[PDB]
Amino acid sequence: FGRDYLIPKPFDTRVLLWVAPEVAKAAMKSGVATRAIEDWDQYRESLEALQGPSKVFIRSAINRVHQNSAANGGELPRIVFPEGTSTKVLKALATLVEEKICQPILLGYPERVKEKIKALDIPLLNDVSIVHPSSHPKYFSFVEKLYSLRQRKGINLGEAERLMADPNYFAAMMVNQGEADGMVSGSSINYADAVRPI
């Protein structure tokens, strides 16, 4: 509660629970009610039934994301998308960035993704970070890490370098190494291939 929180949020499931009964109370107290409510707990049960998960679960999730970011000085989670040119992904990110759900980082050749974004006419993404794995400054430290993790599992430095050039691997490593808070993939390839580097 404060200067940046003066009223409930619209996606707050409690407004109904709090407000509808006080309105009920005021209607009866003013005598304009024709049906008295006696059991108020039972009444709130009746109100919650009206607010089930098919209506409110996602709404509440989003709210919670917002409470989390707000309670952390407002930073949004950094989420990497290895499929930077995926039409579905970019279009979703429009919605997503506009509503402060995360700070996306896209992977791919910058010129080619700025191009797909312009072709699809999504202007909300002109600020988004775009990273090409091989030319990322932390690339070689990443390959060292993958190497050390899998040197006795068929992956030496040459091969680690090769894999780390793949966005799926780069993303997984960013998340692992804390250069990202999470990642989302598989919009454009089969699950096994997308999940394996994770």
Ligand X SMILES: CC(=O)SCCNC(=O)CCNC(=O)[C@H](O)C(C)(C)COP(=O)(O)OP(=O)(O)OC[C@H]1O[C@@H](n2cnc3c(N)ncnc32)[C@H](O)[C@@H]1OP(=O)(O)O
Going by the annotation, the residues of the binding site for acetyl-CoA are: 150, 153, 196
Which of these, 92, 139, 149, 85, lies nearest to 117 by C-alpha position?
Answer: 85
Q: Show binding-site residues.
A: 150, 153, 196
Residue 95 phi/psi, 5-degree rounding, is -55, -45
Give 55's contacts (C-beta < 8 A, 6+ positions apart).
none
Query: Could you tell me the smallest distance in angstroms from the CB atom of residue 162 to a second copy?
Result: 6
Query: Could you tell me the smallest distance in angstroms from the CB atom of residue 164 to ligand X?
Result: 15
Residue 2 phi/psi, 5-degree rounding, is 175, -160
Q: Is 153 in the site for ligand X (CB under 6 A)?
A: yes
Give 144's contacts (C-beta < 8 A, 6+ positions apart).
160
Binding partner of residue 109 among a second copy, ligand X, none, CB under 5 to 8 Å per kind?
a second copy
Binding partner of residue 195 among a second copy, ligand X, none, CB under 5 to 8 Å per kind?
ligand X
Nearer to ligand X, 1 or 191 (CB): 191
Q: Spell out the SS3 assignment of 9-54.
A: CCCCCHHHHHHHHHHHHHHHHCCCCCCCCCCHHHHHHHHHHCCCHH
Q: Is 192 in the site for ligand X (CB under 6 A)?
A: yes
Token code pair at residue 77: 């989670």
Scan residues 52-81 and list those touching a second copy (CB under 8 A).
Answer: none
Q: Is 134 in the site for a second copy (CB under 8 A)?
A: yes
What number of chain residues touch ligand X (CB under 6 A)? 5
Give contact residues for a second copy (rule: CB under 8 A): 109, 134, 154, 158-159, 162, 188-190, 193
Residues lying near ligand X in the complex (CB under 6 A) are found at 153, 191-192, 195-196
